[PDB]
Amino acid sequence: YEVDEDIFRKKRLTIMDLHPGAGKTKRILPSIVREALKRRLRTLILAPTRVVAAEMEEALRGLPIRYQTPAVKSDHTGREIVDLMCHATFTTRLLSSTRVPNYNLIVMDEAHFTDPCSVAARGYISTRVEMGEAAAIFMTATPPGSTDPFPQSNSPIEDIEREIPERSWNTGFDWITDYQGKTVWFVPSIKAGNDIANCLRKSGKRVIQLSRKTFDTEYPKTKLTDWDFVVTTDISEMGANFRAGRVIDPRRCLKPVILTDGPERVILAGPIPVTPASAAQRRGRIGRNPAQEDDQYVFSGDPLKNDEDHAHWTEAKMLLDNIYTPEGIIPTLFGPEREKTQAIDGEFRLRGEQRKTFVELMRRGDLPVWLSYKVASAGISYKDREWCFTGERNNQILEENMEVEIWTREGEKKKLRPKWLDARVYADPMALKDFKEFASGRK
């Protein structure tokens, strides 16, 4: 692969939108890094997930790569070194340090990731590019704005449109279990995944479940051959490689929405249709192997473009408005994503301890951006957990249709009733478990 010379020039942002599997991560990336080093550029590589980052550092092992952990706010050497980190790690460091290096070449892989930390990162990056302080490459077949759900592939894909179960089934879906080979099944939620996986397991199928929280331990198991089904949330759209012959995709997802009628709260709306980019990335899990031309994409429904009510857009602004810049400037969203919110640049900016608490609630507290923002801008200290118990009766959190009760750090049994309700902290057993740990003052 021959690298273009102009992509290393400051004020240039290159959208590397080669089709899924074309060789963006595996082939051109090491070529770009080596060429960046030759030019003595201060280089940053951004991976969507910890797993993908680990694959990058394994592949770039011969080069002066340094993986950067979010447990560390900055890490500067007096040496020629390429920094490697997750999208979210970059955004956290921007919020928590003034010692963020002045990278003049930034590569964001799987730059289609729509999680707020990634949207915020693209905002900061593009701002630096447009200010003439950096060159950046966004690697993704589906850049922000894409609407082709059936892009080019390395090998032919059989696109099959048919009814897909939303829940456990007894009969009428023989084609699912009769299939000889491996399947990746995209589900709209973890608990939808729990039910589907349970159904497949009672049929004697070996299934691995994937979600954001379990991705690190569960994904490596898919690299072995002792499995029939992967049941996964949208997280697998971000550079997850499966050696499988089929994707099952009912093209559905949950969408966080900030509601403003009465007390502000985040709900999880849907299931709703995925975006055409998401559908393409799910489909793009297969058709990757030149030697295997039998791959199937089994789908249901049309994708939906309009996602302007997605909470991730205002959450991205809450992050961006609090990002430290050398000049003191407020960075704006990436061009094509500016339309997604009506927020006035800088309206979410916090000062002093409130800004510090905002960051702490996200990184140490594991809370969503919106929820962290509401607590921090209320003037509440990080260790002060009273808000988890002082909400209105409607804010009572249920588990198995019964009221959740928590032992506090002071040793009192209080009903879990937060002042601010964000559906994501009680969306599934694991999220609730983590949030109970927060409410009981255990982190």
Ligand SMILES: Nc1ncnc2c1ncn2[C@@H]1O[C@H](COP(=O)(O)OP(=O)(O)O)[C@@H](O)[C@H]1O
């Ligand atoms: N660990 C691996 N070993 C061998 N081949 C791989 C590995 N990971 C990916 N590939 C293959 O390399 C090709 C390009 O992959 P990649 O660079 O990830 O595509 P993309 O352009 O989507 O980033 C694909 O055909 C893929 O199947």
Ligand SMILES: [Cl-]
């Ligand atoms: Cl998830």
Ligand SMILES: [Mn+2]
């Ligand atoms: Mn890739």
